Design an enzyme around this catalytic site. Structure first.
Site, short mmCIF file in Angstrom:
data_model
loop_
_atom_site.label_atom_id
_atom_site.label_comp_id
_atom_site.label_asym_id
_atom_site.label_seq_id
_atom_site.Cartn_x
_atom_site.Cartn_y
_atom_site.Cartn_z
N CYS A 94 16.48 -27.62 -9.42
CA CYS A 94 15.68 -27.85 -8.27
C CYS A 94 14.40 -28.55 -8.74
O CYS A 94 13.60 -28.05 -9.49
CB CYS A 94 15.50 -26.50 -7.55
SG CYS A 94 14.23 -26.59 -6.28
N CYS A 111 10.84 -27.06 -8.25
CA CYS A 111 10.60 -26.04 -9.29
C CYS A 111 10.19 -26.55 -10.62
O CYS A 111 9.34 -25.98 -11.28
CB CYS A 111 11.93 -25.26 -9.50
SG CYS A 111 12.51 -24.34 -8.04
#
Lengths: 105, 105
Positions: free
Chosen positions: B32, B35
């Site tokens: 992700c 992130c």
């Protein structure tokens, strides 16, 4: 039916079999509540709409496909046609899903 | 340094090891993008602040913890103190994170 994408080349195979049809792809996880809530509605929709191809990608099983599509929330619905991106929707808002399939089919 | 929670028993161990400090736990995935963007900021806050403990949970490695915490977007930050949930934040909003750290520590 909603077909479960097995890996990167399987995703490409499916995007081809779709021919010219809208493809709606649900990126989901089995630990995710909103994903489990909307999954049955997507299944009902796929049984009726034979001119749209519905696929699903489990982000834990296909982390590479998740990273390729910049997924960050789930469910995320990606709208594609002829292998190309049309639109995306983040979250389980069934009225916005229906609007996007109407727009793009 | 941000410690990676290994399993549910380890989560309890670290909550106990934090004593009376605020604990911030980043639920994240390796695929992700947002992130990965915010992780070095968290490592900097963890090295900077001595009255807060920073942990991380990889949702694909600890799918149970992610389920129990109703995770759906990532990163999601949970704020805990003395075992109690105080707040949560969905997304990589660094200003909101810092505001919830200052409010709750």
């Amino acid at each position: 039916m909603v077909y479960q994408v097995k890996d990167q080349e399987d995703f490409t195979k499916q995007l081809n079999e779709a021919g010219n049809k809208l493809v709606v792809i649900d990126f989901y996880a089995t630990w995710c509540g909103p994903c489990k809530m909307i999954a049955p509605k997507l299944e009902e929709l796929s049984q009726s709409m034979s001119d749209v191809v519905f696929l699903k990608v489990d982000v834990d099983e296909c982390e590479d496909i998740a990273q390729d599509n910049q997924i960050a929330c789930m469910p995320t619905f990606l709208f594609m046609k002829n292998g190309q991106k049309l639109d995306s929707l983040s979250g389980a808002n069934y009225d916005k899903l229906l609007e996007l399939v109407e727009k793009n089919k």
